[PDB]
Ligand SMILES: [C-]#[N+][C@@H]1[C@@H]2c3c([nH]c4ccccc34)C(C)(C)[C@H]2CC[C@@]1(C)CC
Ligand SMILES: O=C(O)CCC(=O)C(=O)O
């Protein structure tokens with residue numbers, strides 16, 4: 381069974397070892413952190429994406445039509461499924477950061493608030509990784525799930541074994557990568573993070589549709605227990621997506637599910653938190 385804490389964002393400094401407790405000690409598996417961003421800020425950002433005045437965010441929208449209903453539309457390239465050079469990824473990452481910064485209008489700033497949370501939950505400095513030639517990684521991508529669309533089952537630690545993570549790998553501690561996301565908008569029904577009790581195993585691909593099908597088989601071959609979560613707008617769900625297989629259930633109704641999220645992990649020497657998408 382999976383164990384998620386649930387606290388208000390005001391309390392995050394009282395859980396200074398929370399990230400260590402999830403990744404290293406495994407004393408629990410995730411957290412719902414309520415009101416990390418105000419509801420106003422989330423609505424504002426959602427409007428910016430609706431109305432088009434999004435600081436250039438729509439210029440880096442990846443519809444991912446060649447994968448159908450099993451993925452989301454992603455603003456900015458995610459690290460998943462990129463060429464090891466990451467040329468396109470770094471181009472969109474740069475745009476994502478300035479666009480995100482623009483839409484949040486320091487109310488509060490996305491990166492500052494997210495870093496503040498991760499800092500309070502670890503007592504560590506928090507940074508966005510840097511590429512071989514100084515290129516910024518993106519701190520997040522925005523995931524848009526339209527009606528009928530879901531996010532196929534997968535697990536995060538597989539991503540660190542993909543060619544696109546070749547640089548990241550060198551910066552990171554080999555421990556579990558956590559996932560985080562914050563809903564900007566929630567759907568009328570469905571669109572729940574469903575986490576399975578099945579654990580990723582290092583003793584058991586890189587092409588994407590091939591990967592998704594490989595995991596869906598692995599999920600159907602085990603049929604293990606699951607729990608569903610549906611955090612509200614502005615709530616951060618932080619959990620061990622690296623270890624536990626999970627998906628996002630089909631979005632029911634016309635209201636799209638918009639999340640801003642990514643991943644975080646310890647640096648090589650466990651003296652820093654990196655976060656990215
Ligand atoms: C959606 N989504 C992302 C991952 C993703 C998948 N397949 C894709 C194909 C093309 C672009 C992205 C993906 C999987 C099912 C691994 C998706 C997991 C969730 C992601 C937001 C992770 C960056
Ligand atoms: O809902 C999202 O944006 C991502 C869901 C997910 O797979 C994760 O949090 O790792």
Ligand SMILES: [Cl-]
Nearest residue numbers: 535536559621
């Ligand atoms: Cl993941």
Ligand SMILES: [Fe+2]
Nearest residue numbers: 535536559621
């Ligand atoms: Fe995930």
